Amino acid sequence: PFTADKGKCGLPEIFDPPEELERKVWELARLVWQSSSVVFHTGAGISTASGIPDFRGPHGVWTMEERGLAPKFDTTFESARPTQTHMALVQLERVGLLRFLVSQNVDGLHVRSGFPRDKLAELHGNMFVEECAKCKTQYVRDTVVGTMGLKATGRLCTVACRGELRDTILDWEDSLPDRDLALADEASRNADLSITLGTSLQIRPSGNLPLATKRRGGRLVIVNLQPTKHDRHADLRIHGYVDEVMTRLMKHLGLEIPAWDGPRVLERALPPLPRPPTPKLE
Ligand SMILES: Nc1ncnc2c1ncn2[C@@H]1O[C@H](COP(=O)(O)OP(=O)(O)OC[C@H]2O[C@H](O)[C@H](O)[C@@H]2O)[C@@H](O)[C@H]1O
Ligand SMILES: c1cncc([C@H]2Nc3ccccc3-n3cccc32)c1
Numbered sequence: 001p002f003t004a005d006k007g008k009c010g011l012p013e014i015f016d017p018p019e020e021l022e023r024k025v026w027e028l029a030r031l032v033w034q035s036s037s038v039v040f041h042t043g044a045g046i047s048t049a050s051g052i053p054d055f056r057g058p059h060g061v062w063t064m065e066e067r068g069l070a071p072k073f074d075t076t077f078e079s080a081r082p083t084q085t086h087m088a089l090v091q092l093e094r095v096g097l098l099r100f101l102v103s104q105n106v107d108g109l110h111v112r113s114g115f116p117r118d119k120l121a122e123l124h125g126n127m128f129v130e131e132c133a134k135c136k137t138q139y140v141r142d143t144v145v146g147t148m149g150l151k152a153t154g155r156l157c158t159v160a161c162r163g164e165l166r167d168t169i170l171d172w173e174d175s176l177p178d179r180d181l182a183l184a185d186e187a188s189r190n191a192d193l194s195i196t197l198g199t200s201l202q203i204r205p206s207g208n209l210p211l212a213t214k215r216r217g218g219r220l221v222i223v224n225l226q227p228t229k230h231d232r233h234a235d236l237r238i239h240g241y242v243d244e245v246m247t248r249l250m251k252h253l254g255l256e257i258p259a260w261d262g263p264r265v266l267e268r269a270l271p272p273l274p275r276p277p278t279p280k281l282e
């Protein structure tokens with residue numbers, strides 16, 4: 001708990017130079033066009049551009065602790081806005097280019113961006129979400145739930161119940177939520193393309209799910225500034241800022257990144273929207 005293994009922290013960042021970065025984001029578009037079933041896997045790195053530090057980056061939570069220094073937030077969790085990345089993911093799901101989204105983040109931003117909860121696995125929990133110990137019903141709150149480690153928050157269930165409401169933030173010894181992990185695993189096994197964004201892939205089983213795609217000949221793409229644990233298994237590794245990678249990708253796909261309306265919760269995915277026709281890939 002005080003000696004939980006925090007993995008490798010503070011590894012040097014890598015930056016693909018611009019022409020190589022272009023070429024790789026073109027190839028990623030190519031793969032997205034060719035695939036039947038795309039699964040995205042996100043970590044802390046997709047929220048750094050909103051002011052939330054990561055864990056293992058050069059100024060990440062664990063990295064700074066290791067050095068005796070403090071992480072820095074440039075926002076609260078409540079005032080944080082979804083990044084260009086987050087909103088790109090919303091659009092890709094709406095046009096049917098994303099089958100499923102697996103996230104390690106507890107920051108609540110995928111939910112608050114309006115991404116549909118039924119195509120999202122929140123493997124490590126959500127700091128805005130509490131859960132009734134009796135009936136399992138979830139409340140998505142507008143402010144962060146004050147506790148971590150699956151503790152009673154002090155509120156009760158109002159289902160047509162009075163069960164104890166508890167946080168959904170897993171501690172080190174807590175096993176992952178069964179529903180989310182089973183769905184994430186199914187999705188990753190059935191995918192022909194897994195794309196990891198802003199994760200170092202060091203936590204298991206979370207960080208191992210993208211490798212399940214390699215199973216039936218799927219492709220694996222890794223987008224990350226640092227090395228990751230599974231770099232050697234990637235078909236493509238793109239070393240650059242995830243917002244620059246995603247904006248370029250959307251531009252190749254002919255998709256706009258949509259406007260955020262402010263915090264919103266979407267339980268169930270809407271009907272799919274029209275999308276550009278596909279290029280000929282010779
Ligand atoms: N703008 C960016 N663009 C690209 N990559 C980025 C950017 N910002 C950061 N990175 C990369 O983003 C990566 C983030 O890696 P880590 O910080 O391990 O986060 P995790 O989500 O995999 O942590 C897993 C769990 O572990 C914790 O204990 C919690 O439980 C987490 O849920 C780095 O490798 C950065 O170089
Ligand atoms: C996601 C990214 N950076 C930091 C966090 C941590 N923020 C935080 C800040 C203060 C108290 C407790 C927490 N916390 C609990 C789980 C993860 C966090 C989450």
Ligand SMILES: [Zn+2]
Pocket residue numbers: 132133134135136137157158159161162163
């Ligand atoms: Zn209940």
